[PDB]
Amino acid sequence: GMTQLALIGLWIGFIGMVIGAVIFGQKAVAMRRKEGMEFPLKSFFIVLWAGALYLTMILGETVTPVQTVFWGRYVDWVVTTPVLLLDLGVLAGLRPKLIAGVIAADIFMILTGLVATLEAPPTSYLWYIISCGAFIAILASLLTEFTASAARRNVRVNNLFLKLRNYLIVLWICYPIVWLLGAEAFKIIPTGVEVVIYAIIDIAAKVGFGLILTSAAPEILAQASN
Amino acid sequence: GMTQLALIGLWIGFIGMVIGAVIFGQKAVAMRRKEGMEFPLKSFFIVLWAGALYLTMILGETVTPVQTVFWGRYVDWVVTTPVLLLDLGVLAGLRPKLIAGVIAADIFMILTGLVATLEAPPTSYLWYIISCGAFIAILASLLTEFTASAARRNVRVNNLFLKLRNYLIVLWICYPIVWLLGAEAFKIIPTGVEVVIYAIIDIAAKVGFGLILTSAAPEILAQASN
Amino acid sequence: GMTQLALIGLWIGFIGMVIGAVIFGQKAVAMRRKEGMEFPLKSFFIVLWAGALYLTMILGETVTPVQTVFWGRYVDWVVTTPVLLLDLGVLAGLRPKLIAGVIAADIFMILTGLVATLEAPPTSYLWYIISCGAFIAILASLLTEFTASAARRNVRVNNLFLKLRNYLIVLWICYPIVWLLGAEAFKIIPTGVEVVIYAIIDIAAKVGFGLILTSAAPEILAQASN
Ligand SMILES: *C/C=C(C)/C=C/C=C(C)/C=C/C1=C(C)CCCC1(C)C
Ligand SMILES: *C/C=C(C)/C=C/C=C(C)/C=C/C1=C(C)CCCC1(C)C
Ligand SMILES: *C/C=C(C)/C=C/C=C(C)/C=C/C1=C(C)CCCC1(C)C
Ligand SMILES: CCCCCCCCCCCCCCCC
Ligand SMILES: CCCCCCCCCCCCCCCC
Ligand SMILES: CCCCCCCCCCCCCCCC
Ligand SMILES: CCCCCCCCCCCCCCCC
Ligand SMILES: CCCCCCCCCCCCCCCC
Ligand SMILES: CCCCCCCCCCCCCCCC
Ligand SMILES: CCCCCCCCCCCCCCCC
Ligand SMILES: CCCCCCCCCCCCCCCC
Ligand SMILES: CCCCCCCCCCCCCCCC
Ligand SMILES: CCCCCCCCCCCCCC
Ligand SMILES: CCCCCCCCCCCCCC
Ligand SMILES: CCCCCCCCCCCCCC
Ligand SMILES: CCCCCCCCCCCC
Ligand SMILES: CCCCCCCCCCCC
Ligand SMILES: CCCCCCCCCCCC
Ligand SMILES: CCCCCCCCCCCC
Ligand SMILES: CCCCCCCCCCCC
Ligand SMILES: CCCCCCCCCCCC
Ligand SMILES: CCCCCCCCCC
Ligand SMILES: CCCCCCCCCC
Ligand SMILES: CCCCCCCCCC
Ligand SMILES: CCCCCCCCCC
Ligand SMILES: CCCCCCCC
Ligand SMILES: CCCCCCCC
Ligand SMILES: CCCCCCCC
Ligand SMILES: CCCCCCCC
Ligand SMILES: CCCCCCCC
Ligand SMILES: CCCCCCCC
Ligand SMILES: CCCCCCCC
Ligand SMILES: CCCCCCCC
Ligand SMILES: CCCCCCCC
Ligand SMILES: CCCCCCCC
Ligand SMILES: CCCCCCCC
Ligand SMILES: CCCCCCCC
Ligand SMILES: CCCCCCCC
Ligand SMILES: CCCCCCCC
Ligand SMILES: CCCCCCCC
Ligand SMILES: CCCCCCCC
Ligand SMILES: CCCCCCCC
Ligand SMILES: CCCCCCCC
Ligand SMILES: CCCCCCCC
Ligand SMILES: CCCCCC
Ligand SMILES: CCCCCC
Ligand SMILES: CCCCCC
Ligand SMILES: CCCCCC
Ligand SMILES: CCCCCC
Ligand SMILES: CCCCCC
Ligand SMILES: CCCCCC
Ligand SMILES: CCCCCC
Ligand SMILES: CCCCCC
Ligand SMILES: CCCCCC
Ligand SMILES: CCCCCC
Ligand SMILES: CCCCCC
Ligand SMILES: CCCCCC
Ligand SMILES: CCCCCC
Ligand SMILES: CCCCCC
Ligand SMILES: CCCCCC
Ligand SMILES: CCCCCC
Ligand SMILES: CCCCCC
Ligand SMILES: CCCCCC
Ligand SMILES: CCCCCC
Ligand SMILES: [Mg+2]
Ligand SMILES: [Mg+2]
Ligand SMILES: [Mg+2]
């Protein structure tokens, strides 16, 4: 029931995650019995879950015609975006309870975005604004407590945190902008194009992010983990 | 599909949680880099989640005609009641493995209560009794191992624990009593009145509890958090 | 909607879990002030959750006629199989981050198995293969990382781990074999017989496992817990 372009977009996301899974799985094998192996392993789980959920959408299991609702992508994001933040929190050396609070905010952001996607205007816009409020709090925490914590660590660990922090922030800001421009609000981006855009940003946000992270020198990953 | 009285009750709950969010949000900001900030932060998250779920019920998103089933309140409780017990566990100095067991019992209590609410008599009463059994186990834990652990701490931390322990017990006992008197069992309390009562108890159990906790002297919260 | 044999199988599983919960619950209460009490408590929670889900299937709550899908057993397994792996990880002395990774693989195994159960052939077989891939990763970790960590512990703790590791592995391999032979796939085993078989293996994998673990000498459980 979806457009041909939407199906192409789902295939792009799926193949991207599968390639990521091979890359990070191999890196994790290469890092067995080494400090810092948690980083390729987390990257591997992120792309494995995203890849599985892309497959459920290809198969029509987590999409629903009402326009097609691609609700599987929220099942993906509600699991993978916390693990991405966990990555930065470990790099930053952030206290576990603070990491937990940001993960709670993130899950709230994704679930209110799901409600926004399922609703009709203008109620959908209310939930979009609520979810953006949670996003802004997450961005503020990244730019403040994460950054202050990372600045107390070794220079190379701090440098890697800042690179990934900035990469994550730029990519994540793309999502609510695409949402607002797409069929859920202003209807500027056609539904099929929207699926393709999300797949490209997903690949950047998960495979690109993991490539930057896991390509750091092994000594840096070792000291970052402890 | 709900009565006007029920809608009034949902708005009371919603506005109460929003006011609580302002209070605990300001307290969390004020304790930004102080030991004990975890307490206003958890209180903020509790009323944020409860307020969002009250909003989903106002909007008819988590309410289903089957006779109006307010199943959104279980999505609220299954998340917020564990965090309330975590609060008491940190104050008591309780070992995390013991906190985990009581949280598991609490999630079991809420989920069996959801099955009781969705079921028809007499099967609904079976699940009510099972959920009550989990509740009695939680109460016994609060009165025994939580209380013995708190009694090892200094006088002011122990006194704060006991105040919040007693407050929590009295308010939580109200819930299964309202449930038994309302539409799901004896049908003594009309559905609309039941919604109003839950909103008032919810405000007391989340905002009132958080106010007692977050108004303690900051040095006590700092000591309790260690 | 379900056969008489299938209902008999559900009652066998339910009664087995109730028996386990009495045994492990009383053992947990008897160990209330001792090191190692986490083992009977986790065993109690495992059979409590499984028994409750068996009850939901007896009552038709987590069973849907499609020709009958027993989807409640996935709600059971997604919670209990992680706790069983946690048991082995505590006995082995495994690093918590490693336990978290195998638990993630296990949840993925159970959820992809649920998708396989809900799907139609040949798509169901794709998810079965994916789930088997996760299962193989779990078995590999049990036979490598868990085993290496246990061998660095006291001979009595290590001997207990190996006995439970071998017991668990043999029993868990039975599940995907039954699945492929049964009603969710190739229909060699009648549906009613398949329910009875799952009840028997479930009792062995939860009550039998818990009996072996909690019957160890209390000093062995004590040093394993630390
Ligand atoms: C791997 C997937 C990633 C990094 C997805 C990130 C998604 C977001 C940051 C979503 C943001 C949203 C809002 C801030 C408002 C409501 C709409 C959303 C869910 C797209
Ligand atoms: C903020 C919300 C709170 C503190 C809610 C607490 C709810 C309960 C203690 C519910 C208890 C129930 C039983 C013990 C039996 C079954 C019915 C319930 C779920 C109302
Ligand atoms: C107490 C319940 C237990 C120990 C259940 C264990 C279940 C499994 C190991 C399931 C395995 C499966 C596969 C590996 C492939 C797909 C079918 C499953 C879910 C039966
Ligand atoms: C309807 C079938 C459409 C098939 C579309 C093929 C996708 C083309 C591959 C693009 C994968 C990008 C991988 C990026 C790796 C970093
Ligand atoms: C370094 C260890 C970090 C551990 C992070 C714990 C995750 C906390 C997430 C719990 C939040 C539950 C949100 C439920 C829906 C709002
Ligand atoms: C058929 C429409 C094609 C749509 C092209 C979408 C490109 C969107 C890119 C947005 C951000 C790119 C992140 C890449 C960073 C390396
Ligand atoms: C001091 C921090 C304590 C944190 C304990 C978190 C325990 C998490 C609860 C585990 C129980 C899961 C049961 C799920 C049943 C659906
Ligand atoms: C071990 C748990 C004790 C639970 C206390 C039982 C309270 C009585 C509830 C019985 C349900 C009666 C349904 C009312 C029929 C209108
Ligand atoms: C010691 C810390 C954990 C204490 C909580 C134990 C969990 C007890 C749950 C019991 C549920 C029984 C329901 C059946 C009653 C008829
Ligand atoms: C040291 C104990 C002080 C805290 C005591 C709190 C008592 C809570 C009063 C709540 C009033 C609700 C009454 C409902 C009775 C059915
Ligand atoms: C512990 C529960 C306290 C609840 C107090 C509520 C008092 C008002 C309830 C009156 C309901 C009677 C409605 C009359 C119309 C049928
Ligand atoms: C003693 C160590 C306990 C470790 C428990 C951590 C559990 C983390 C589970 C990771 C969640 C992955 C879920 C994927 C699908 C929702
Ligand atoms: C889709 C699942 C991906 C599986 C991970 C692939 C890992 C490849 C291992 C490569 C090891 C090479 C050693 C030199
Ligand atoms: C649609 C009916 C809603 C009326 C309730 C509004 C109450 C007045 C607003 C109070 C503002 C709350 C400040 C935190
Ligand atoms: C109505 C179904 C008959 C009841 C049979 C009872 C099942 C016995 C379970 C065995 C428990 C095993 C504990 C080791
Ligand atoms: C800042 C944006 C808040 C959400 C407003 C959405 C308005 C969409 C207009 C749709 C016209 C087709
Ligand atoms: C028709 C309005 C009914 C008003 C109900 C008042 C509820 C007070 C509950 C107090 C419980 C602590
Ligand atoms: C409309 C209802 C407003 C309730 C706001 C509650 C703030 C104080 C809570 C005290 C709990 C006893
Ligand atoms: C521990 C709970 C007691 C068990 C009650 C089982 C009730 C079975 C009812 C079957 C009727 C369809
Ligand atoms: C122990 C951590 C390894 C988890 C690996 C999961 C493997 C999933 C395989 C998917 C089937 C192709
Ligand atoms: C690497 C994944 C291994 C999967 C094992 C295959 C299970 C049997 C497939 C038969 C399905 C019809
Ligand atoms: C929280 C403030 C409530 C203001 C009510 C707005 C009414 C809009 C409904 C059309
Ligand atoms: C009222 C709930 C059941 C109470 C059992 C525990 C009482 C022990 C008091 C120390
Ligand atoms: C941390 C103890 C393990 C409990 C696993 C529960 C998994 C629920 C998945 C839905
Ligand atoms: C009527 C079902 C009886 C099933 C027999 C259970 C015992 C078999 C253990 C191998
Ligand atoms: C770290 C995994 C988070 C999963 C959150 C799921 C909430 C629906
Ligand atoms: C029906 C919900 C109206 C809320 C306004 C939405 C835009 C802020
Ligand atoms: C974590 C803060 C969430 C704020 C949501 C409301 C913003 C309008
Ligand atoms: C985009 C959120 C603004 C937060 C900035 C915090 C101060 C660097
Ligand atoms: C059509 C190919 C898409 C490649 C995505 C690249 C992500 C940075
Ligand atoms: C439409 C009913 C609104 C009720 C407002 C309640 C005041 C807190
Ligand atoms: C229709 C407005 C009635 C609101 C009642 C307010 C009770 C707090
Ligand atoms: C500083 C402690 C933050 C704890 C917040 C967790 C809320 C679930
Ligand atoms: C800081 C005020 C938060 C407002 C609560 C919003 C409830 C969804
Ligand atoms: C800010 C909350 C708006 C709620 C609108 C309710 C419309 C039925
Ligand atoms: C009658 C609708 C039941 C929906 C409840 C689902 C809550 C997880
Ligand atoms: C610690 C709060 C999260 C509990 C959520 C459980 C939902 C089944
Ligand atoms: C002590 C941790 C127990 C958690 C198990 C929860 C299963 C219902
Ligand atoms: C069909 C289930 C009936 C159980 C009723 C038990 C009430 C105590
Ligand atoms: C489309 C029929 C299969 C349904 C599978 C649902 C998986 C979430
Ligand atoms: C259209 C889905 C086909 C899945 C292939 C089955 C692999 C055994
Ligand atoms: C993959 C099967 C290995 C089983 C070996 C365990 C010894 C009983
Ligand atoms: C190699 C020893 C494994 C024996 C366990 C089998 C239990 C059915
Ligand atoms: C080593 C066990 C893998 C599961 C394959 C199931 C056999 C049909
Ligand atoms: C792993 C990609 C499979 C593609 C099938 C056409
Ligand atoms: C491995 C995925 C193949 C599915 C084809 C739709
Ligand atoms: C459109 C139905 C999707 C529900 C997502 C949980
Ligand atoms: C059912 C999910 C509701 C989340 C709103 C915070
Ligand atoms: C769970 C939220 C559903 C909203 C449908 C409009
Ligand atoms: C904090 C509210 C954000 C709204 C911007 C769209
Ligand atoms: C709108 C909420 C923003 C919070 C910033 C700390
Ligand atoms: C089909 C769109 C391809 C865009 C390349 C980044
Ligand atoms: C979602 C079903 C939960 C059952 C609790 C016993
Ligand atoms: C858990 C679902 C219960 C529904 C019974 C009508
Ligand atoms: C209309 C009910 C109001 C209740 C406030 C105590
Ligand atoms: C009607 C407001 C209720 C406040 C909680 C005591
Ligand atoms: C019930 C609210 C109490 C507030 C104490 C500061
Ligand atoms: C007919 C009842 C059989 C029970 C087997 C344990
Ligand atoms: C280090 C692996 C943890 C995986 C988190 C989902
Ligand atoms: C792991 C793929 C399916 C997850 C949603 C049930
Ligand atoms: C299932 C095969 C496991 C391999 C053991 C190293
Ligand atoms: C390896 C487990 C031995 C079997 C115990 C009955
Ligand atoms: C793998 C079993 C196939 C059965 C064909 C009837
Ligand atoms: C009824 C059979 C019990 C199986 C115990 C291993
Ligand atoms: Mg929409
Ligand atoms: Mg009901
Ligand atoms: Mg099937």
Author numbering:
A (entry chain C), B (entry chain A), C (entry chain B): 0 to 65, 68 to 227
Publication passage describing the model:
The crystal structures of cell-free-synthesized N2098R and N4075R were determined at 2.65 Å and 1.9 Å resolution, respectively. Since the two structures were almost identical, only the structure of N2098R is described. Next, to further examine the ion-transporting activities of the CyRs, we heterologously expressed three synthesized rhodopsin genes—N2098R (BAY09002.1), B1401R (WP_074382570.1), and N4075R (GAX43141.1)—in Escherichia coli. A light-induced decrease in pH was observed in the suspensions of the cells expressing each of the rhodopsins (solid line), and this decrease was almost completely abolished in the presence of the protonophore carbonyl cyanide m-chlorophenylhydrazone (CCCP) (broken line). These results showed that N2098R and B1401R transport proton from the cytoplasmic side to the extracellular space. On the other hand, N4075R was thought to act as an outward proton pump, but its activity was smaller than that of the others. Therefore, the possibility of transporting other ions cannot be excluded.
